[PDB]
């Protein structure tokens, strides 16, 4: 009802004015009127979702999984590491780590920490997003895929995303649709992922 709360009417012909609805001498309601209604505004009724055939989606999760095993693709996507073998597989005991820094040492030992150095640099976006709480954005880095629980130890690492093998999704494996994220699976997670 915005802009419609007024009994404003149009004098019609007779007083040398355009036939615009006025009230108390001010034009109202119509779209070309200051304070007037919005002609074709955003609507609640609009369906803002997107359907995706399950097969087409599952094929995407598998295709994203594959992108993970291609160091060249991974390097292309932007990640900064120094290995040749990827994904990076780790002992199930990784799931038992508790301290964040225990994971840093392991990543440095694996020559994968550089990517975190990459994400350790937030960006202050241009635009009003900031007025709505979107002042920052940062690069996406390592995704840790365990199987029992998301690694609480790794999650706080700059740009790090933690996920579990049974529900790791396309967005996890390819942030923003960009294939080849630098992943690190848990031996057990690696196996479960085989059947997705």
Determine, following the binding rule CB under 5 A, whether residue 3 of this chain makes contact with Mg ion.
yes
Determine, following the binding rule CB under 5 A, whether residue 5 of this chain makes contact with Na ion.
yes
Closest separation in Å from C-beta 134 to RNA: 4
Q: Return the number of the residue (84 or 149) whose C-beta is nearest RNA.
A: 149
- Looking at residues 174 to 193 of the shown chain, list those that interact with RNA (rule: CB under 7 A): 175-178
Determine, following the binding rule CB under 7 A, whether residue 48 of this chain makes contact with RNA.
yes
Task: Indicate the burial class of 14 (C-beta count within 10 angstroms; 0-12, 13-18, 19 or more).
Answer: exposed
113 contact partners, CB below 8 Å, separation of at least 6: 104, 107
Closest separation in Å from C-beta 77 to Mg ion: 10
Which residue from 158, 169, 166 is spatially nearest to 186, judged by alpha carbons?
Answer: 166
Closest separation in Å from C-beta 91 to RNA: 19
Applying CB under 7 A, the span of 27-35, 65-73, 84-92 interacting with RNA comes to 27-35
What letters, b where the CB count within 10 A reaches 16 and e where it falls short, cover 78-92? bbbbeeeebbbebee
Q: Return the number of the residue (35 or 83) whose C-beta is nearest Mg ion.
A: 35
Determine, following the binding rule CB under 7 A, whether residue 129 of this chain makes contact with RNA.
yes
Determine, following the binding rule CB under 7 A, whether residue 32 of this chain makes contact with RNA.
yes
Residues 154, 100 contacting (CB under 8 angstroms): yes
N-to-C CA span, the chain:
49
The tokens of 62 are what? 């598998």
Q: What is the DSSP letter of 128?
A: G
Closest separation in Å from C-beta 59 to Na ion: 28
| 155: partner contacted, choices RNA, Mg ion, Na ion, none (Cβ within 5-8 A by kind) | RNA
Determine, following the binding rule CB under 7 A, whether residue 87 of this chain makes contact with RNA.
no
CA-to-CA distance for 193 and 2, rounded, in angstroms?
52
Residues 162, 143 contacting (CB under 8 angstroms): yes
CA-to-CA distance for 76 and 99, rounded, in angstroms?
31
Q: Return the number of the residue (3 or 21) whose C-beta is nearest Mg ion.
A: 3
Return residues touching Mg ion (CB under 5 A): 3
Return residues touching Na ion (CB under 5 A): 5, 47
């Amino acid at each position: 009802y915005a802009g419609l709360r007024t009994p404003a009417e149009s004098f019609g012909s007779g007083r040398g004015q355009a036939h615009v609805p006025k009230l108390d001498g001010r034009a109202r309601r119509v779209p070309q009127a200051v304070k007037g209604r919005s002609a074709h505004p955003p609507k609640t009724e609009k369906d803002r979702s997107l359907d995706l055939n399950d097969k087409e989606r599952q094929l995407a999760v598998r295709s994203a999984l594959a992108a993970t095993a291609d160091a060249d693709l991974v390097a292309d996507r932007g990640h900064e590491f120094d290995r040749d073998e990827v994904p990076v597989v780790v002992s199930d005991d990784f799931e038992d780590l508790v301290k964040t820094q225990e994971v840093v040492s392991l990543l440095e030992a694996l020559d994968v920490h550089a990517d975190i150095d990459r994400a350790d640099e937030t960006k202050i976006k241009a635009g009003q997003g900031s007025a709505r709480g979107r002042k920052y954005r940062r690069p996406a880095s390592i995704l840790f895929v365990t199987s029992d629980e998301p690694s609480t130890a790794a999650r706080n690492l700059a740009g790090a995303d933690v996920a579990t093998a049974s529900e790791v999704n396309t967005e996890d494996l390819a942030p923003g649709g960009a294939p080849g994220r630098l992943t690190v699976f848990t031996e057990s997670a690696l196996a479960e992922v085989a059947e997705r």
